[PDB]
Scaffold this active site. Structure first.
Site, PDB file in Angstrom:
ATOM      1  N   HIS A  13       0.836  -1.330  -0.022  1.00 33.60           N
ATOM      2  CA  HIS A  13       0.047   0.050   0.113  1.00 33.60           C
ATOM      3  C   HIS A  13       0.818   1.168  -0.096  1.00 33.60           C
ATOM      4  O   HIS A  13       0.593   2.206  -0.383  1.00 33.60           O
ATOM      5  CB  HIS A  13      -1.193   0.131   1.219  1.00 33.60           C
ATOM      6  CG  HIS A  13      -2.274  -0.685   1.073  1.00 33.60           C
ATOM      7  ND1 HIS A  13      -2.163  -2.111   1.097  1.00 33.60           N
ATOM      8  CD2 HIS A  13      -3.548  -0.357   0.606  1.00 33.60           C
ATOM      9  CE1 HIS A  13      -3.487  -2.515   0.912  1.00 33.60           C
ATOM     10  NE2 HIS A  13      -4.248  -1.352   0.667  1.00 33.60           N
TER      11      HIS A  13
ATOM     12  N   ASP B  78     -10.529  -2.458   1.694  1.00 36.38           N
ATOM     13  CA  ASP B  78      -9.017  -2.580   2.154  1.00 36.38           C
ATOM     14  C   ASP B  78      -8.967  -3.435   3.384  1.00 36.38           C
ATOM     15  O   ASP B  78     -10.060  -3.698   4.160  1.00 36.38           O
ATOM     16  CB  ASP B  78      -8.338  -1.406   2.653  1.00 36.38           C
ATOM     17  CG  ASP B  78      -7.927  -0.537   1.396  1.00 36.38           C
ATOM     18  OD1 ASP B  78      -7.233  -0.955   0.408  1.00 36.38           O
ATOM     19  OD2 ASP B  78      -8.523   0.697   1.314  1.00 36.38           O
TER      20      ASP B  78
END
Lengths: 168, 170
Positions: free
Chosen positions: A21, A90
């Site tokens: 990420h 996520d």
């Protein structure tokens, strides 16, 4: 709303501590996280005032599910409450705290069902994983998933029939 | 709460980057690199309007060694470098809703006796354009003398660094 920015900052910091990420663009943080915060469809776990784990989910209709699976960055905020087909947008726990996140979801969403997509960029194949809360009956969950899947596959195939190549 | 304030500020800045055509493409790693030491050292200005951020700039106070390290790689500074000397550099300057003049004025009037540089890498040119900024109480003649010295010191040391890159073994 001051709360809002604070949460956004925590999530940004946690993305920055995560091997994949941290490479993603700020555009994707706004896309994935602002609606999560606005709709309160997220869990943020903390230790010693620092974030350690985060997951978020969008409650989609079939149209938005297909849109998302064609392009994971295409959802807008309104899509996040557009239906009852739940997707983890996520799920991160870069310091090893995934079991705590899992348990939190299991216990706090005991009768809910969620899917997630993972894409392997070296094969260009996406895989779908299934998650369900801690109290919902295994047989019932597995049947709801089969139905989601059949609906998705059938609509994809229908859309497959209209696809074409653009040429000058 | 010192660090909830911290996260809050980091979120505001992230939102601002995400609203900006160029910054929104930069990675989260660069946000942490550029913004965490700004917040820690309090070397930033965050302008707000109706409780929303609108603009942000930050600066690192470098020595000549870290200036060169920074110009060779804009993502290479670590937190300690930010207070390492007296050569000031704007690390971020963002005002995605058109409030850049406001940042400029705020800096001019609130840092009236300070000098800052900033680097923009063209990009259609492979040249970085260094800009020079000074507070409202530094006159032109003085600013230009100090900047010329900064520049000559930078150029000389960049040249001298070439001598330490290689040895010949035959």
């Amino acid at each position: 709303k001051i709360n809002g920015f604070e949460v956004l900052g925590e999530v940004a910091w946690l993305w920055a501590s995560s091997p994949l990420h941290r490479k993603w663009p700020l555009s994707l943080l706004a896309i994935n996280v602002l609606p999560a915060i606005e709709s309160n469809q997220y869990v943020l776990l903390k230790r010693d005032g620092f974030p350690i784990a985060f997951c978020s989910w969008a409650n989609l209709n079939l149209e938005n599910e297909i849109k998302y699976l064609d392009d994971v960055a295409s959802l807008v905020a309104d899509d996040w409450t557009s239906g009852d087909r739940r997707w983890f947008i996520d799920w991160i726990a870069p310091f090893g705290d995934s079991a705590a996140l899992y348990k939190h979801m299991r216990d706090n969403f005991p009768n809910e069902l969620f899917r997630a997509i993972r894409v392997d960029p070296d094969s260009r194949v996406g895989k779908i994983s299934e998650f369900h809360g801690g109290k919902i009956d295994k047989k019932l969950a597995s049947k709801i998933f089969q139905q989601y899947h059949f609906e998705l596959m059938s609509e994809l195939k229908n859309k497959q029939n209209f696809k074409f190549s653009l040429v000058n």
